[PDB]
């Protein structure tokens, strides 16, 4: 029985950044598309 | 009086910056043990070990960039040093005066070694040749080519037969001094060799590399006598005991390890230093060890005889 | 911006000398990015803190991201965007002392900045370069946020 | 237009495969 | 989610029943997942009851698990003692059941070999790994540990051979394929590493493997490090890396490395504020990723926050590297140079050269810092003769280095034409140095002129003393 693996070693304990990072990426993409 | 390994003295703030080399020499006529240290603060310092204490005798300046190596002669009262700017300087330890200077260009003159007779200085070079300078002449008498990369360390066998060199690729090269011919070219390690040494009897060659391993070779046949591990980072210096049955090494892991060549086991480890221990050396009779590192400290360790 | 200092601290001890007040406890914390030392009185009744907690600490001279300064008066009906929105525990205080290890000939290498948040005291101590925004008699905001 | 020669790289290097002791 | 309820039930049972070895062990077996200290405490409690009431020697499995927890903590000495006890216990009670205890000893033996690796006893570890492999040729982990040790030695062919040997036993082993791919990528062989990681994603059980996808996206990330004139190719690579990272972030929302990859791509895109936000989020999550510290320090430098950048570089170097990494040292030197602390920058570059004396970029950077320091001193008209002479010596050193580097240098990193122009500037500075040294000498003779006046006045004071004396 082993607990640490190649998939859980890339993960934070609990914190999730999906919402914040995707919001940030949306703003960057929105600003990129606005400029021409 | 039972004797055990243990620190005996500790000189703090010995240099302004990291201490990158050390050398211990014993002079019979003066009967005073001398220690020469070079540092990245561009200063050479000469201390005298007396009454179980270190007392500064000379503080020699002149080197432009950091002092990489400092050596003493086994018989003469001379010392040598090299800086990061490839300048070599000879110092008279009796008066603390610069005997002469050798401008080895921008690349040559990395690390210094005194020949057993103290009549020559051997220094590795960037191109891959070991240049030899006359101590009295002050000029490059000749050079032995290895066809290799940067030579990080140099050694002289006490009997004077061979001079060894370690490259940045881990290859070891042993030259016959008498004929100046490359006797052997050994694979060695795969990481740079920063320090190699010979046994007092000239029978063994001990090399240290960045992989944390210390390799022993039999120079007669150039065969691998053994491999030692136990350092958690780069090994930076090795030095053989006068008793010939022990030697000491230092590493980036802030420890100084004394190994037994017979049992091939580390017999002691000192953790006193707080940074990379760049230099470690034995005294004349092998009852003391001097160590210097990036923490700008000089440590003396007792040893049983 | 108006930010004087920022780091993440670990709570290493709480009331080491024993509890002196019922609703206030003294935190001893160390930061990792800048190796700063912190002593901080916190209203633990409203903002409980436990040993081993981690928080983001910001010392700011203003709460407005546009760098505008404040009158120092309660302005509850102001709804401009505020740094306080990003944080859980916010205090307002005044720098009352700056100590250092300077000698008669050498500038300080380590500074200690003391702040009083209406009598809840803070001492931020470390390398002088981190503490160069602190001036005695200046008003600062302390922003704290626990992070998991 | 002179300065220290150093190319800044934003690196994302994955950790080595874990080999912790196994529990029975 | 159920493991916490099991923990609660078992914790409730243990509190109600102080003497329940099985409950303590059951609780420990779930505290291991996240609570090393709690699992250790539970195992210790179970051992206490076994010795006190049961009066029986600890089972080898509990000793092995206690030792493994200590290994995870860092108590290598306690781990060695417990692993040796577990091997001894499994051997002692092997007659009761040889088959089971042989397997228990195999796992315990592998643990002890891994510990020896931790204690830097690589000879004992290698011998133990080979001993295991001799009897159990299907133990893949032993092959991979030998390959890892060989790779750590620096023998990459031996490492690949051991890794291929592991793949022989288990054709589809994601860890073995990852190790081979990591070996190839570390050698900058992009195609081989790419194929080895795409192979894993071709398998059905690992159709969407986070580790493999991150490596595949990192391959495209590394192409942005080297500047390229082709804007379209660089931009497409940025998009490709971002897409891979976004997919990994969708599949896993707690992936620190996907977030760090997004930030690195954003920073390479020029969005330093957004990249800082991502890095700060990741930094809040953890402090054990050195690339996060370095990326934060890079952003600090780009934002002209030099105080934070220098501390971050120094602290990152101290925490994450036992030896000296010349790349981070060069980063620290650049940060100090931007801050204007040229003396500290020179010392840092000299420290780099001490370890990497063949680096031509370090030589060029040392020459540039020397020229700047000498020029600053020369321009200063309040400098004494000693400082001016030192600056003259330093200008000569810089001029020699620039000329030598122009004669031979690493064209891929810096242009030799720039070095030639720098050499000309050093020569011109030395030409004006003659006037400067003349200026310094006249200055210091004026210094001795005032000193005599100081002595002159003091003698008059003595004259009054004699008037007082008489």
mmCIF file of C-alpha atoms in Angstrom, chain A residues 1 3-4 6-7 9-18 20-22 24-25 27-29 31-32, chain E residues 3 29 32-33 72 174-175 178 209-212 214 249 252-257 259 271 273-274 281:
data_model
loop_
_atom_site.group_PDB
_atom_site.id
_atom_site.type_symbol
_atom_site.label_atom_id
_atom_site.label_comp_id
_atom_site.label_asym_id
_atom_site.label_seq_id
_atom_site.Cartn_x
_atom_site.Cartn_y
_atom_site.Cartn_z
ATOM 1 C CA UNK A 1 0.000 0.000 0.000
ATOM 2 C CA UNK A 3 -0.148 6.762 -0.811
ATOM 3 C CA UNK A 4 1.982 9.147 -2.904
ATOM 4 C CA UNK A 6 2.723 10.452 -9.873
ATOM 5 C CA UNK A 7 -0.809 11.916 -10.047
ATOM 6 C CA UNK A 9 2.205 14.626 -6.323
ATOM 7 C CA UNK A 10 1.077 17.313 -8.791
ATOM 8 C CA UNK A 11 -1.975 18.290 -6.727
ATOM 9 C CA UNK A 12 -2.523 20.824 -3.982
ATOM 10 C CA UNK A 13 -3.907 19.632 -0.677
ATOM 11 C CA UNK A 14 -7.300 21.320 -0.971
ATOM 12 C CA UNK A 15 -7.013 24.698 -2.664
ATOM 13 C CA UNK A 16 -8.665 25.008 -6.074
ATOM 14 C CA UNK A 17 -7.610 27.645 -8.613
ATOM 15 C CA UNK A 18 -9.732 26.472 -11.550
ATOM 16 C CA UNK A 20 -9.733 32.045 -10.531
ATOM 17 C CA UNK A 21 -7.259 30.894 -13.183
ATOM 18 C CA UNK A 22 -9.958 30.423 -15.812
ATOM 19 C CA UNK A 24 -7.960 35.352 -15.326
ATOM 20 C CA UNK A 25 -7.497 33.521 -18.627
ATOM 21 C CA UNK A 27 -9.889 38.348 -19.084
ATOM 22 C CA UNK A 28 -6.596 37.892 -20.938
ATOM 23 C CA UNK A 29 -8.419 36.336 -23.888
ATOM 24 C CA UNK A 31 -8.422 41.784 -23.805
ATOM 25 C CA UNK A 32 -6.535 40.002 -26.589
ATOM 26 C CA UNK E 3 -12.123 7.545 5.131
ATOM 27 C CA UNK E 29 -3.975 2.673 8.580
ATOM 28 C CA UNK E 32 -1.182 7.348 7.249
ATOM 29 C CA UNK E 33 -2.852 8.918 4.217
ATOM 30 C CA UNK E 72 8.419 9.989 5.501
ATOM 31 C CA UNK E 174 3.686 4.246 -16.487
ATOM 32 C CA UNK E 175 6.499 4.905 -14.010
ATOM 33 C CA UNK E 178 8.023 8.217 -17.357
ATOM 34 C CA UNK E 209 -2.605 10.991 -17.724
ATOM 35 C CA UNK E 210 -1.919 14.225 -15.868
ATOM 36 C CA UNK E 211 1.813 13.574 -15.505
ATOM 37 C CA UNK E 212 2.213 12.655 -19.176
ATOM 38 C CA UNK E 214 2.124 18.030 -18.210
ATOM 39 C CA UNK E 249 -6.596 22.012 -15.194
ATOM 40 C CA UNK E 252 -7.709 18.270 -12.224
ATOM 41 C CA UNK E 253 -8.580 21.542 -10.496
ATOM 42 C CA UNK E 254 -5.996 21.066 -7.713
ATOM 43 C CA UNK E 255 -3.031 20.682 -10.083
ATOM 44 C CA UNK E 256 -0.309 23.061 -8.921
ATOM 45 C CA UNK E 257 1.849 22.368 -11.972
ATOM 46 C CA UNK E 259 -1.390 26.447 -12.763
ATOM 47 C CA UNK E 271 1.201 39.349 -19.013
ATOM 48 C CA UNK E 273 0.421 40.908 -13.645
ATOM 49 C CA UNK E 274 -1.782 37.922 -14.475
ATOM 50 C CA UNK E 281 -2.185 31.659 -5.847
#
